[PDB]
């Protein structure tokens, strides 16, 4: 059981695009005050992931990588593969 991976379910607020949340405070879920102590109307937002090779594929862990490019000007960083002419009508591909 790979319980190292964990997820959050009892979070009050939504997140903006590409917004990180790392706070692990006890989530106050309702009317009765908790004063920071889990109990009535209070849950822990963090939950460990039950992750074993014996599991359903939907329940099975998936490694997800998200890349957010910016196809705009300014120097890039990635561009697979020249010589500049200087007076003739020639197609140019200067950094993008």
């Amino acid at each position: 059981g790979n319980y190292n991976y964990r997820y959050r379910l009892f979070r009050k607020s939504n997140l903006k695009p590409f917004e990180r949340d790392i706070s692990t405070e006890i989530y106050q879920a309702g009317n009765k005050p908790c004063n920071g102590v889990a109990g009535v109307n209070c849950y822990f937002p963090l939950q460990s992931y039950g992750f074993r090779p014996t599991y359903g594929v939907g329940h099975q862990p998936y490694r997800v990588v998200v890349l957010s490019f910016e196809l705009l000007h300014a120097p890039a960083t990635v561009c697979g593969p020249t010589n500049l002419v200087k007076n003739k009508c020639v197609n140019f591909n200067f950094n993008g």
Partner: nanobody
Amino acid sequence: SAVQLQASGGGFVQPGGSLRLSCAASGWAETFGHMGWFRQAPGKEREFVSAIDWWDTVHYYADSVKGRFTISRDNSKNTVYLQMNSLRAEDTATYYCAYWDMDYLQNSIPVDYWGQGTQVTVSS
């Protein structure tokens, strides 16, 4: 499908004795599923303890608790009861009540719920 499983009780007891673990549901679940417990030793990862259904038909005990810890649900009180005996070292930890959701157990793998626990300490 969100339960605020309420837990209460605890105290300090002596080694080699016996006690009980508490786990009661005070919220709205997703179905009539299984109930159990999970424990975590200091400096060690969380460890599964025991598994039992809504009707105490199937009795899955851990080997560290077999013959000594006898889990059993209630005729009418709707509460499983892990009654201990001859306590060992591994059974003294911070316990969390487990809750699965299945009738025919193909595998004991899928978990569905969690709740608060009871502060049980076993020392002289």
